[PDB]
A paper describes a structure:
The X-ray structures of both psychrophilic DERAs were determined with resolutions of 2.1 Å for C. psychrerythraea and 1.8 Å for [name]. Superposition of the structures with those of meso- and hyperthermophilic DERAs revealed a high similarity of the monomeric units, with root-mean-square (r.m.s.) deviations (RMSD) in the range of 0.63–1.65 Å. We note that the relative orientations of protomers as well as the characteristics of the dimer interface for both psychrophilic DERAs closely resemble the situation in the mesophilic (E. coli) enzyme. Comparing the substrate binding pockets of the new structures with DERAEC, no amino acid exchanges or significant conformational differences were found within a radius of 5 Å about the natural substrate (as represented by the covalent intermediate included in PDBID 1JCL12). DERAs from psychrophilic species had a similar thermostability and were around 20 K less stable than DERAEC. In contrast, helices 5 and, particularly, 6 and 7 show markedly reduced strengths of rigid contacts in the psychrophilic enzymes. The relative B-factor distribution of the backbone atoms reveals a tendency towards increased flexibility in helices 0, 6, and 7 of the psychrophilic DERAs, compared to DERAEC. Hence, our X-ray structures provide independent clues in favor of the hypothesis that adaption to low temperatures in psychrophilic DERAs involves a more flexible environment of the substrate binding pocket. In the reduced state (i.e., without formation of the disulfide bridge), the A95C mutation turned out to negatively affect the stability of DERASH and DERAEC, but did not influence the stability of DERACP. While in DERASH and DERAEC the melting point of the oxidized form was still lower than the wt value, the exchange led to a marked increase of 8.4 K in thermostability in the case of DERACP.
Numbering used by the authors:
A (entry chain B): 1 to 248
B (entry chain A): 1 to 247
Amino acid sequence: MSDLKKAAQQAISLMDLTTLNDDDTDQKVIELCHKAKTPAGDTAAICIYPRFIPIARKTLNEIGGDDIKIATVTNFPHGNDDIAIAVLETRAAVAYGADEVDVVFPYRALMEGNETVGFELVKACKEACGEDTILKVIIESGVLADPALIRKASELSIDAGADFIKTSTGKVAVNATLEAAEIMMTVISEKNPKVGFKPAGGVKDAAAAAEFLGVAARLLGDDWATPATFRFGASSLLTNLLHTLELA
Amino acid sequence: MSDLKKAAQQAISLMDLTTLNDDDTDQKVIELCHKAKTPAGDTAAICIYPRFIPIARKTLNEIGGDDIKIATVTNFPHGNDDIAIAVLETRAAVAYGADEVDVVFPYRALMEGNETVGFELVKACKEACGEDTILKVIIESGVLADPALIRKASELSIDAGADFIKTSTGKVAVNATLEAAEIMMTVISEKNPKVGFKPAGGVKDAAAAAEFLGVAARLLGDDWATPATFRFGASSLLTNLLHTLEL
Ligand SMILES: [Cl-]
Ligand SMILES: [Cl-]
Ligand code: NA
Ligand code: NA
């Protein structure tokens, strides 16, 4: 379907193609780099564990992937409230050569009533990134669950300097939801439309992708979603999108 | 045994207590930190994968392990000849908070006749260590095998700024040998006695530790081996040494 095909095409261009598994290997990351060069155009990025960034950058720069960004994760997936540890991991991610770092918000601390440590952790990790590395903040909306907490995590993250707010780690029972997307992009519209949104997990197919893009278009404008403002964090979405486009 | 127990005690004080397994976890690294606080005194260091450095430092600083160093590995275990990758990994190790980085020498390239990349990779990684992180260079002497190659990798590494030269990754068939130790510490005595030596893997027991220390004593002097100049890289030696000390 043309509406569906347009969504599939845009979703691929906005994808953070991800592999974050305990049994990941250089070989598997190399294969992911090749997969990022899709028949429908390059994805926006790949997302991998920090130690695989050097071989991924080497590989992308060998296969025409020079403009595919490398994102990684820190404070992950636990979202513990030790700022020092999150900062060290973020510094290492930057040193490996990450273009983007997706850090996990201390959501358990927020749920216990501590708003300060979330703000300070994001602020400290953004400082470790600098002006030239993107920081995405995973608020784990699927666990926060409560709309007020989702909103508060989003506000704290943006005030602390987040470049993106991201729904989920993909490691818990509930990942990206439309309900969370509504809240988070509303907060973005209220505070700073330069801040991006990243639904991660929970995006089945092109139809689901279209739904998330539809919320963005509605709240922030038809042209708002771009690689600089919107990413799909996905490990098993691309093949379905390619089938929607009748490829692979 | 008196001489044996003295060797065991010293070997513990010089140990880089190591865990480098594909199934390593935060929990296993925390347990290793506690194990480094041995009944015979603290080990010199622990050696773990870079991503575990932050939780290891937090743990050591909680449990009286403040003076136990954290070493890690880069370009590991392959010793590939891509300098850019080895340097990025070394920069990351430093950023994680490593006190020491054990980088693998491009030993296959040397066996193919390329001395240049060995020198250049060690030199670049030493630069990435900055001022506050020392560099150990793993030459994989058990694979180099030939005395000329073991000597050459040692010389190249030291000229390139290595703070230690280290026999092995522990991930190949042959690790530390007494023959390699002889050659490597002879090169140290020739060039710079401030450079350290680290036999890694294949140190069986107190008797074997005593043999390696005996080589150091003969080539460099009775008082030469210290935490700043000698480490045992070991993942399964400590329990044996404690049994020798009857602990
Ligand atoms: Cl990692
Ligand atoms: Cl690692
Ligand atoms: Na982690
Ligand atoms: Na490695």
